């Protein structure tokens, strides 16, 4: 209000305009604006014009807001009010960086302004201007040293900069003033302490943290956090005796938390496989209801102790009749030997149960009811599905459906069978069945909708989801209202499977809009968490948001979009499918989708192979080399990565150098380090001849080099002897698509001797059935 210097009547008016804005008396504030602006002497008066525009913006009249705030500002560019309003206005449009400039300019003319300092800092942390947030939080603490928020923010400033020790000293200072105060909430103090402890730990001051935790432990009420970080620290300090006590208490508190079993193994250090099993034995007899202690030894036991435990585990689970027994053991199925122990044992259980309703003929216990046999048949149905024997699995599920036609789980597994066997259209009808058996269960509804989606019955999936969708609007619009990315990702794949690239891109883009929205959702907790002192979770959320697009949903969407934008480059508010497929620069839009992957998903080989495809079409040979290398670091023998090097090696040798002879020779020195392309391919096929996914990548590549040995390409690609390490349904679909593909030149001849040769191998798979 000092920035404004007006006659009393208007100075009074002006104060009312500010007050109307704070109390959202917009219609009344507007009247006062017009009163000042109607007097000719102040029709140009900048702060009233700025305050006019900001009020208008609250009523959704953005462009008149921008005319007014801009015009008002220009009349008085040394008014902190005008600069502050322009920042305020640009903030409501999430243009946070530009808002920062206006606040900094406003403080050029009002250095110690409390509101602008708070607003400015609030955006600096939002944008991760960590240096500037510390300046701003420091400036605040000097002006308002007795306000808790002044210290909280200063400490947070240094923590996020990783100046752990300064963060430590600010926090201890604040903690002293909070021990004395009577206004202190136990919970808020407790949270302050665990945050103070966490920074000490993140600074690797492990013993200081432990002494702190023991000093203030009785004033910390989150006793889970007390004991969990006590165990962490005691292990870190080699207090293994005391660590074991801590983790024994933890396991009593929650016997179904894996972490405390690994803490005990770290504390006790069992020397042999049986000393380690003692840890879990003791947990059983102490927590007989618990299932985690009886499951985890199956991961490390072997030999006859493995089958004894498995025998106890399956008998328990088959008598209690719980469904997810097979699900719990799927990780054991990576061990080819354990699977035989399972198969011989469960198969034995069935043959024994029919001759005499006992798990083994020599068992003493009372006879098992008929349900016990259904559960082993339900297991073996899932077991033979995983083994890759569809028909053998499909007979078990059908015997069991005939015995108890009421148990919905058998219809899901029957659907899973037909899916795994490459017949999703069949799988879909079994979900429809299962779904109609419990109209009330959305979990079944979703799986039906999902299977219908994958079967490209998109409109049928909408109507199925609609059974749980809000009755106001249509189902797709409510799923997007509720940030349902499983439906939208699965929908984008379906739309992409039917060459409806426009509609798929619409779904891919709606998923990004969700991640934008979630990224913005942090804004309100910046201040909230300073009054709540939930600082651990606050910094956890800040760290979460910094890598938010690491989530599987983003990658699933981004993959689909990048595939479509490449296929649209090879052959060419409101998201309209038609307009989105029309994009004049498809590779540029793909780049926008790839950028978060390049930063946050360097784990995956795909993020570099995709990047390669964008830069390969985009001519950029420097970026093309960057992508092949990071992929080579992850898996040197990857079949897609192989196809990518053979395409880079030769477009360097063959044509369009158009760069410094160093850029033209750097690839010659770098690729001859990582001789000749054709023998480079032959050696790949040499080392990886047994593998087929590799074998095809060689096969297409030898056709890339010449069309003459196409016939040999066709024979190396269509090998189907069981010698092959990875000859499965989806790879064979890859090979036969590769003949229609054109990547093997017009092989309609071998394509149908291949479709029919594959129909005999996967008789349920649809991709291989006669016309």
């Amino acid at each position: 209000m000092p920035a404004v210097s007006l006659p009393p009547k208007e100075n009074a008016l002006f104060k009312r305009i500010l007050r109307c804005y704070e109390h959202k008396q917009y219609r009344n504030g507007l009247k006062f604006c017009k009163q000042i602006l109607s007097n000719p002497k102040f029709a140009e008066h900048g702060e009233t014009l700025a305050m006019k525009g900001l009020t208008l913006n609250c009523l959704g009249k953005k462009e008149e807001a921008y005319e007014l705030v801009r015009r008002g500002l220009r009349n008085d560019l040394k008014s902190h009010v005008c600069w502050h309003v322009y920042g305020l206005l640009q903030r409501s449009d999430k243009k946070y960086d530009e808002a920062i400039k206006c606040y900094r300019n406003a403080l050029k003319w009002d250095k110690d302004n409390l509101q602008i300092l708070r607003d400015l800092s609030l955006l600096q942390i939002q944008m991760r201007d960590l240096e500037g947030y510390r300046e701003t939080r420091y400036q605040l603490l000097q002006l308002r040293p007795a306000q808790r928020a002044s210290w909280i923010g200063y400490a947070i400033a240094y923590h996020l900069l990783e100046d752990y020790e300064m963060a430590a000293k600010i926090l201890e200072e604040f903690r002293k003033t909070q021990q004395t105060s009577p206004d202190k909430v136990d919970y808020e103090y407790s949270e302050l302490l665990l945050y103070q402890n966490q920074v000490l730990r993140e600074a690797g001051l492990y013993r200081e943290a432990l002494e702190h935790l023991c000093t203030y432990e009785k004033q910390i009420c989150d006793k889970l956090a007390v004991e969990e970080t006590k165990g962490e620290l005691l292990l870190q300090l080699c207090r293994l005796e005391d660590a074991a006590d801590v983790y024994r208490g933890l396991q009593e508190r929650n016997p179904e938390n894996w972490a405390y079993y690994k803490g005990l193994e770290k504390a006790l250090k069992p020397a042999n496989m049986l000393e380690r099993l003692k840890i879990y034995e003791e947990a059983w007899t102490k927590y007989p209801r618990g299932l985690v202690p009886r499951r985890l030894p199956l991961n490390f036991l072997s030999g006859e102790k493995f089958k004894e435990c498995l025998d106890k585990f399956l008998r328990m689970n088959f008598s209690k009749g719980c469904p997810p027994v097979f699900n719990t053991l799927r990780s054991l199925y990576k061990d080819k030997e354990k699977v035989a122990i399972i198969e011989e044992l469960v198969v034995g259980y069935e043959t024994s149960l029919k001759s005499c309703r006992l798990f083994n003929p020599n068992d003493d216990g009372k006879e098992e009811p008929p349900t016990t046999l259904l559960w082993v048949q339900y297991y073996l149905a899932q077991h033979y599905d995983k083994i890759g024997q569809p028909s053998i699995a499909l007979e078990y599920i059908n015997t069991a459906i005939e015995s108890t036609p009421t148990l919905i789980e058998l219809f899901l597994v029957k659907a899973k069978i037909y899916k795994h066997a490459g017949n999703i259209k069949e799988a879909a009808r079994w979900m429809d069945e299962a779904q109609a058996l419990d109209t009330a269960d959305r979990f079944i509804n979703s799986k039906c909708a999902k299977y219908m989606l994958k079967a490209n019955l998109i409109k049928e999936a909408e109507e199925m989801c609609s059974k749980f969708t809000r009755e106001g609007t249509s189902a797709v619009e409510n799923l997007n209202e509720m940030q349902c990315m499983w439906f939208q990702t699965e929908c984008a794949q379906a739309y992409k499977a039917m060459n409806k690239f426009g509609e798929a891109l619409k779904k891919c883009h709606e998923i990004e809009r969700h991640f934008i929205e979630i990224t913005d959702d942090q804004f309100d907790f910046h201040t909230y968490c300073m009054r709540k002192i939930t600082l651990r979770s606050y910094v956890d959320l800040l760290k979460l948001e910094d890598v938010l697009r690491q989530h599987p949903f983003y990658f699933k969407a981004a993959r689909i979009a990048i595939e479509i934008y490449l296929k649209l480059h090879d052959n060419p508010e409101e998201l309209i499918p038609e307009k989105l497929a029309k994009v004049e620069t498809p590779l540029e839009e793909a780049i926008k989708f790839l950028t978060p992957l390049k930063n946050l998903v360097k784990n995956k080989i795909e993020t570099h192979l995709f990047a390669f495809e964008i830069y390969f079409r985009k001519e950029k040979f420097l970026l093309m080399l960057q992508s092949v290398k990071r992929a080579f670091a992850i898996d040197s023998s990857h079949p897609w990565l192989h196809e990518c090097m053979i395409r880079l090696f030769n477009t360097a040798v063959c044509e369009s150098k158009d760069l410094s002879d160093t850029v033209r020779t750097v690839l010659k020195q770098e690729m001859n380090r990582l001789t000749n392309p054709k023998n480079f391919n032959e050696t790949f096929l040499k080392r990886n001849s047994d593998s087929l996914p590799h074998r095809l990548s060689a096969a297409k590549m030898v056709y890339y080099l010449d069309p003459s040995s196409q016939k040999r390409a066709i024979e190396l690609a269509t090998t189907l002897d069981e010698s092959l390490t990875n000859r499965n349904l989806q790879t064979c679909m890859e090979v036969l698509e590769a003949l229609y593909d054109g990547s093997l030149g017009d092989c309609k001849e071998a394509a149908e001797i291949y479709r029919a040769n594959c129909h005999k191998l996967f008789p349920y798979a649809l991709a291989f059935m006669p016309p």
Binding site: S190, L291, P323, S331, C484, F525, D540
Partner: protein, 160 residues
């Protein structure tokens, strides 16, 4: 299945589980609201691969009419992992946390009166008791029962 305290990087996965399992859905911001207000209170159940098969999203009631008490915003267990006791185990963990962190004297939740499944779960297995009906609670228009589980015996077993 692993049962552990939910953390902010778990909430999207919780939201996915919710959307698969239940009709009452929330936006991510509401999930953040819980994890940044009552972090100790929500628990998850995950499998070998860190995939969520159950959760309990919980809070303290913000303006309790009487004593402080916790409130179940949402609880789901995928039917595929039915019959392993996760709903009880999840519920027992949030209960213990509400006691330690907020001195809750009970836990309350809401249920459509026609939701037989949930009524039988909460009343028969979790010792929840009907206390009061909220007329036309749901946007559907159905009345809700409010159910309370007394937390003072648990609290006494903990102090021992």
């Amino acid at each position: 299945m692993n049962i552990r305290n939910a953390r902010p990087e778990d909430l999207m996965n919780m939201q996915h589980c919710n959307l698969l399992c239940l009709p009452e859905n929330y936006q991510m911001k509401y999930y953040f609201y819980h994890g940044l207000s009552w972090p100790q209170l929500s628990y998850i159940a995950e499998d070998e691969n860190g995939k969520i098969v159950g959760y309990v999203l919980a809070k303290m009631e913000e303006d309790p009419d009487d004593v402080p008490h916790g409130h179940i915003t949402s609880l789901a267990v995928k039917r595929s992992h039915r019959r392993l006791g996760l709903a009880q185990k999840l519920m027992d963990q949030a209960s213990r946390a509400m006691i330690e962190n907020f001195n809750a004297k009970y836990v309350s939740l809401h249920v459509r009166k026609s939701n037989r499944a949930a009524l039988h779960l909460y009343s028969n297995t979790l010792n929840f008791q009907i206390s009061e009906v909220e007329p036309k609670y749901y946007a559907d228009g159905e009345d809700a029962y409010a159910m309370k589980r007394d937390l003072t015996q648990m609290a006494d077993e903990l102090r021992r």
